[PDB]
Ligand binder design. Structure first.
Ligand SMILES: *[C@@H]1O[C@H](CO)[C@@H](O)[C@H](O[C@@H]2O[C@H](CO)[C@@H](O)[C@H](O[C@@H]3O[C@H](CO[C@@H]4O[C@H](CO)[C@@H](O)[C@H](O[C@@H]5O[C@H](CO)[C@@H](O)[C@H](O)[C@@H]5O)[C@@H]4O)[C@@H](O)[C@H](O[C@H]4O[C@H](CO)[C@@H](O)[C@H](O)[C@@H]4O[C@H]4O[C@H](CO)[C@@H](O)[C@H](O)[C@@H]4O[C@H]4O[C@H](CO)[C@@H](O)[C@H](O[C@@H]5O[C@H](CO)[C@H](O)[C@H](O[C@@H]6O[C@H](CO)[C@H](O)[C@H](O)[C@H]6O)[C@H]5O)[C@@H]4O)[C@@H]3O)[C@H]2NC(C)=O)[C@H]1NC(C)=O
Ligand SMILES: *[C@@H]1O[C@H](CO)[C@@H](O[C@@H]2O[C@H](CO)[C@@H](O[C@@H]3O[C@H](CO[C@@H]4O[C@H](CO)[C@@H](O)[C@H](O)[C@@H]4O)[C@@H](O)[C@H](O[C@H]4O[C@H](CO)[C@@H](O)[C@H](O)[C@@H]4O[C@H]4O[C@H](CO)[C@@H](O)[C@H](O)[C@@H]4O[C@@H]4O[C@H](CO)[C@@H](O)[C@H](O[C@@H]5O[C@H](CO)[C@H](O)[C@H](O[C@@H]6O[C@H](CO)[C@H](O)[C@H](O)[C@H]6O)[C@H]5O)[C@@H]4O)[C@@H]3O)[C@H](O)[C@H]2NC(C)=O)[C@H](O)[C@H]1NC(C)=O
Ligand SMILES: *[C@@H]1O[C@H](CO)[C@@H](O[C@@H]2O[C@H](CO)[C@@H](O[C@@H]3O[C@H](CO[C@@H]4O[C@H](CO[C@@H]5O[C@H](CO)[C@@H](O)[C@H](O)[C@@H]5O)[C@@H](O)[C@H](O[C@@H]5O[C@H](CO)[C@@H](O)[C@H](O)[C@@H]5O[C@H]5O[C@H](CO)[C@@H](O)[C@H](O)[C@@H]5O)[C@@H]4O)[C@@H](O)[C@H](O[C@H]4O[C@H](CO)[C@@H](O)[C@H](O)[C@@H]4O[C@@H]4O[C@H](CO)[C@@H](O)[C@H](O)[C@@H]4O)[C@@H]3O)[C@H](O)[C@H]2NC(C)=O)[C@H](O)[C@H]1NC(C)=O
Ligand SMILES: *[C@H]1O[C@H](CO)[C@@H](O[C@@H]2O[C@H](CO)[C@@H](O)[C@H](O[C@H]3O[C@H](CO[C@H]4O[C@H](CO[C@@H]5O[C@H](CO)[C@@H](O)[C@H](O)[C@@H]5O)[C@@H](O)[C@H](O[C@H]5O[C@H](CO)[C@@H](O)[C@H](O)[C@@H]5O)[C@@H]4O)[C@@H](O)[C@H](O[C@H]4O[C@H](CO)[C@@H](O)[C@H](O)[C@@H]4O[C@@H]4O[C@H](CO)[C@@H](O)[C@H](O)[C@@H]4O)[C@@H]3O)[C@H]2NC(C)=O)[C@H](O)[C@H]1NC(C)=O
Ligand SMILES: *C1O[C@H](CO)[C@@H](O[C@@H]2O[C@H](CO)[C@@H](O[C@H]3O[C@H](CO[C@@H]4O[C@H](CO[C@@H]5O[C@H](CO)[C@@H](O)[C@H](O)[C@@H]5O)[C@@H](O)[C@H](O)[C@@H]4O)[C@@H](O)[C@H](O[C@H]4O[C@H](CO)[C@@H](O)[C@H](O)[C@@H]4O[C@@H]4O[C@H](CO)[C@@H](O)[C@H](O)[C@@H]4O)[C@@H]3O)[C@H](O)[C@H]2NC(C)=O)[C@H](O)[C@H]1NC(C)=O
Ligand SMILES: *[C@@H]1O[C@H](CO)[C@@H](O[C@@H]2O[C@H](CO)[C@@H](O)[C@H](O[C@H]3O[C@H](CO[C@H]4O[C@H](CO)[C@@H](O)[C@H](O)[C@@H]4O)[C@@H](O)[C@H](O[C@H]4O[C@H](CO)[C@@H](O)[C@H](O)[C@@H]4O)[C@@H]3O)[C@H]2NC(C)=O)[C@H](O)[C@H]1NC(C)=O
Ligand SMILES: *[C@@H]1O[C@H](CO)[C@@H](O)[C@H](O[C@@H]2O[C@H](CO)[C@@H](O[C@H]3O[C@H](CO)[C@@H](O)[C@H](O)[C@@H]3O)[C@H](O)[C@H]2NC(C)=O)[C@H]1NC(C)=O
Length: 440
């Protein structure tokens, strides 16, 4: 019996230049709860290929995610494909509340191929994500024009001369970042800068290129430029800054004109393995930026440094009340539309230790009063507002983490923090005054 998943996200993808052969899909979209360290996630992907007119499925099983422990994941088994296919795919957690999936091309994951059908296509991708609260989140990303996986294990070419500028390039979330120093003879004012990279490690060949053109008038100190690495561009664009490190016209000897160069290119897959080599090409020309003069090269390493900001953002609200059961009104689902046919309030007692018990409080337009939800109350109010009644009365400010989500999947997470019990004034049983011991 196949998935139901409330909340499905569409996503168009296309290939820019020929690929380095990763093939990468990122998903700013799933829920990673803030102030939650026990929050597992049940990921299950599914690629829909095409061989001849024939459409062939491939279900991968990533099992359970442990965001507070593991950053990178590999499917643990996969029904419907070749073998040694288990490490053909790669699901990596990234920055703020998001995922990326990298399944390499040039190594067919479909054995179902007779020599005849050497030609294989990748039509779309399904990434299932079952919530800690048990909400299945689907994310169907579809290749604009089918992408052709064409086996190869060819060219194991390194580049040649290139002065090694020992400085290591490190990748964090598929985003590389290095600052290489470089000097350009003949560049005071009349300098045309043109950089071009190419991370050539492993069976992977990424190739980045300035797109908006060259920096024709290289002003002094921090020129920012955009670059387009071949593959599947990331929402966080990829750029670089050429900053100057030498006087205007005030040098004359050997040291031509010094510059500090910083590269920030994106989709740079771990598949590239560590000990790959970043080639940086540059000239001081405008006639043929192509294959021009100087080449500088650096080694790259893939940190397994679990991204920091993994949990989704928060807007805390402080309440203080006395009635021994407070009430917050989770405002409108997303914004301006009191006619969604799918709202979902969702409660949380901050930093919960146990999954089988702490994630039971949930509401919907058609539900009401959830099974295991102890001491939290929730029911919709006027204009789609949602009042939550917290009655777990203590004398130590509990912070509740609410999450609401529209039919659009525009999640929004509050973080109310009930100061609760302010406490009775000492003279509670008396305090009836009149000026008698004071002038009047
Ligand atoms: C990297 O990429 C980089 C960027 O993409 C690139 O820069 C780099 O590559 C190369 O770098 C080279 C330098 O390193 C550079 O040369 C390359 O770029 C260009 O070169 C071409 C070709 O150049 C020339 O060859 C011509 C023929 O041989 C020659 O006419 C030119 O000029 C002379 O000056 C010498 C010095 O006196 C003289 O000995 C010569 O005999 C000759 O007269 C030059 O040798 C250029 O064509 C091209 O561009 C134009 O732009 C440049 C820069 O602006 C000019 O030098 C050139 O003349 C031409 O431009 C003008 O064009 C527009 C359109 O009309 C004008 O509106 C604009 O303002 C500009 O001109 C002025 O010139 C007019 C014509 O003479 C004047 O009439 C005008 O008027 C005046 O008003 C003023 C106030 O408003 C004053 O009043 C002034 O004054 C005098 O005033 C006194 C009293 O005060 C009195 O009244 C008197 O009567 C009066 O006369 C008025 O005249 C105004 O002055 C390029 O710029 C470059 N490559 C490229 C493609 O960029 C790349 N690197 C690599 C390695 O890849
Ligand atoms: C590194 O990467 C970075 C990211 O890529 C990059 O940064 C980007 O740089 C960009 C610059 O290219 C920036 O985009 C711009 O930013 C300026 C800031 O405002 C923004 O608005 C953007 C779009 O809405 C938005 O994306 C941004 O976030 C931002 O908020 C903006 O001012 C810029 O300029 C204008 O100029 C561009 C370029 O030409 C033009 O496309 C825009 O329309 C706009 O210019 C108009 O207005 C002026 C004055 O009125 C006119 O002089 C212009 O001619 C033009 O206007 C019109 O004439 C038409 C004819 O009469 C008329 O139709 C138009 O009106 C309405 O226009 C509608 C569409 O625009 C539509 O056409 C509508 O429709 C009817 O249409 C039908 C048919 O459809 C019929 O024609 C009908 O007749 C008609 O009525 C019209 O009525 C106008 O009046 C520019 O947008 C961006 O900020 C930035 N991004 C980021 C995140 O940084 C870096 O640069 C890269 N780094 C390097 C170093 O390169
Ligand atoms: C990998 O990296 C390496 C290094 O990081 C890159 O190396 C280099 O490639 C470039 C080309 O890309 C070569 O280019 C030109 O080089 C010259 C000269 O180089 C020096 O030669 C001096 C003089 O003698 C001669 O030797 C050369 C070559 O054999 C012949 O061409 C001549 O005919 C002549 O025989 C020599 O004096 C100078 O230095 C000495 O220093 C050493 C060590 O200190 C001593 O052993 C020696 O005794 C000398 O002592 C000196 O030391 C004292 C003490 O400080 C000092 O007082 C003295 O004054 C003296 O320095 C070198 O050995 C360079 O002149 C050219 O310069 C032009 O560029 C300038 C910089 O921007 C600019 O300011 C100038 O105006 C010139 O510019 C213009 O050229 C353009 C383009 O052609 C024109 O369009 C424009 O209009 C102008 O004409 C120029 O740089 C380098 O020589 C080469 N370096 C090495 C070490 O090999 C390599 O490229 C890179 N590879 C890749 C793929 O990126
Ligand atoms: C909160 O509210 C929202 C809104 O109400 C709810 O969202 C709705 O959610 C429900 C389910 O919960 C969705 O059903 C519903 O609609 C869309 O999805 C269904 C399913 O679509 C796709 O899946 C089909 C099932 O397939 C799988 O099948 C394979 C093999 O068969 C299995 O092995 C897999 O394991 C897997 O499970 C596919 O068959 C289907 O299509 C095939 O077609 C492809 C392209 O045409 C082809 O290339 C591919 O190879 C496949 O073979 C697809 O992948 C759809 O049925 C609905 O779509 C219609 O459009 C289809 C495509 O255009 C037509 O084929 C179909 O006849 C439908 O009819 C059309 O209507 C249009 C416009 O009115 C008209 O022009 C046209 O003439 C047709 O009559 C649909 O897109 C969404 N509804 C909305 C509004 O988005 C949400 O569930 C709820 N949440 C909560 C909390 O409960
Ligand atoms: C499922 O996957 C399996 C395996 O992944 C697929 O099947 C296999 O078929 C491969 C060939 O197509 C076999 O080749 C491996 O071993 C090679 C030999 O090993 C190094 O080779 C040196 C030189 O070679 C010969 O020596 C042999 C023994 O002496 C001899 O038979 C032969 O005649 C030659 O004389 C040898 O001296 C040295 O001691 C060592 O044996 C090796 O060259 C193969 O390539 C590698 O390349 C990949 C890609 O990087 C790496 O992942 C591998 O670990 C391995 O090693 C490196 O190469 C890197 C890049 O150059 C380098 O940077 C790095 O440092 C390292 O040295 C290959 O390993 C397999 O043995 C065979 N496997 C099995 C189990 O039978 C199978 O088809 C797949 N199935 C499907 C459906 O897809
Ligand atoms: C703050 O919020 C809390 C919850 O969010 C509000 O809830 C009250 O809190 C207490 C717990 O702290 C609940 O126990 C309370 O409960 C029900 O209490 C009744 C029990 O009745 C009595 O009689 C027996 C037998 O003689 C006796 O042994 C016992 O001690 C007691 O005296 C239930 O009967 C009642 O349910 C019934 O009544 C309705 C209407 O007729 C029926 O439709 C129901 O089916 C059911 O039979 C209560 O549910 C709970 N109180 C209420 C009224 O909700 C708390 O009120 C709130 N504080 C304020 C002031 O807002
Ligand atoms: C999220 O869910 C909302 C509530 O259902 C959608 O309205 C919203 O919208 C796409 O958003 C568009 C912006 O209003 C809207 O667009 C179109 O058609 C009109 C009429 O020709 C044009 O004026 C607009 O330019 C626009 O193309 C669509 O209704 C909407 N699509 C759907 C199916 O809702 C969703 N937003 C997101 C994140 O997708």
């Amino acid at each position: 019996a196949l998935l139901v998943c409330q909340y499905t996200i569409q996503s168009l993808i296309q290939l820019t230049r020929d690929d380095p052969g990763f093939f990468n899909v990122e998903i700013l979209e799933f829920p990673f709860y803030p102030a939650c360290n026990v929050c597992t996630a049940d990921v299950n992907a599914t690629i829909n290929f095409d061989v001849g007119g024939k459409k062939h499925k491939l279900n991968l099983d990533f099992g359970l995610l442990t965001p507070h422990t593991k950053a990178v994941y590999q499917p643990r088994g996969a029904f419907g494909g070749s073998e040694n296919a288990t490490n053909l795919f790669l699901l990596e957690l990234l920055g703020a509340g998001e995922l990326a999936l990298t399944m390499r091309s040039k190594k067919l994951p479909i054995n179902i191929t007779a020599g005849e059908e050497q030609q294989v296509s990748l039509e779309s991708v399904d990434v299932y994500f079952q919530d800690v609260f048990g909400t299945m989140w689907c994310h169907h990303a579809e290749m604009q024009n089918p992408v052709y996986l064409i086996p190869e294990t060819v060219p194991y070419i390194k580049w040649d001369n290139c002065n090694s500028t020992n400085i290591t390039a490190v990748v964090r979330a598929q985003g590389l970042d290095v600052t290489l120093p470089l000097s350009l003879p003949t560049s005071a004012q009349d300098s045309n800068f043109s950089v071009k990279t190419e991370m050539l490690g492993n069976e992977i060949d990424i190739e980045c290129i300035m797109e908006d053109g060259e920096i024709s008038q290289v002003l002094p100190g921090d020129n920012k430029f955009n670059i387009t690495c071949s593959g599947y561009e990331s929402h966080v664009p990829s750029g670089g800054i050429l900053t100057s490190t030498s006087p205007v016209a005030t040098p004359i000897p050997g040291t031509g004109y010094a510059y500090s160069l910083r590269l920030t290119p994106r989709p740079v897959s771990r598949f590239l393995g560590n000990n790959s080599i970043l080639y940086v090409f540059y000239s001081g020309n405008g006639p043929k930026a192509s294959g021009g003069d100087y080449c500088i090269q650096s080694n790259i390493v893939f940190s397994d440094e679990i991204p920091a900001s993994q949990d989704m953002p928060t807007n805390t609200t402080d309440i203080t009340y006395v009635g021994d059961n407070a009430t917050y009104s989770v405002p409108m689902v997303t914004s301006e539309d009191a006619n969604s046919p799918n709202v979902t309030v969702t409660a949380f007692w901050a930093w919960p230790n146990n999954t089988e018990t702490d994630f039971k409080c949930k509401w919907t337009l058609t539900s009401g009063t959830p099974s295991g939800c102890e001491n939290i109350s929730g029911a919709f109010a006027s204009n789609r507002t949602f009042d939550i009644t917290v009655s777990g009365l203590g004398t130590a400010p509990k912070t509740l983490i609410i999450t609401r989500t529209a039919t659009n999947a525009t999640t929004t997470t509050h973080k109310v923090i009930f100061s609760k019990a302010p406490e009775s004034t000492t003279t509670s049983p008396t305090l009836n005054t009149t000026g008698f011991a004071a002038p009047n």
